[PDB]
Design a protein around this ligand. Sequence first.
Ligand SMILES: Nc1nnc(-c2ccccc2O)cc1N1CC[NH2+]CC1
Length: 121
Amino acid sequence: SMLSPNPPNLTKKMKKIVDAVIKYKDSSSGRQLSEVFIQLPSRKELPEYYELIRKPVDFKKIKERIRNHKYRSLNDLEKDVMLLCQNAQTFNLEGSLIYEDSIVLQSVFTSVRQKIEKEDD
Ligand SMILES: Nc1nnc(-c2ccccc2O)cc1N1CC[NH2+]CC1
């Protein structure tokens, strides 16, 4: 809540981590793996997703939760990113493009978080 903000360095690290996850591009393919995950379609647009996924989330919402200080730790942020990817893996088949992209984005998050959490070490 804005009534009691996070320390500014935490907000800054959250933003740096999510920005790097969103910008990640495979070199061999050129594709920004996050693009399909920025905004989930609405219930009227993709009702099958909401029948299968109990807790929908997208990167648009994750960015809002950084800016509103809803996440109180990098762990809080990580839980939502991993929820997004697990949701993608539940709605899509193993080996499909969107499933596999979400697997890589999990690893990108873990790698980026390690670098940024320790950048003052
Ligand atoms: N198949 C799909 N799987 N997952 C997502 C998705 C989007 C945001 C956050 C989490 C997600 O899982 C979107 C998908 N669609 C691709 C085809 N166009 C409609 C949307």
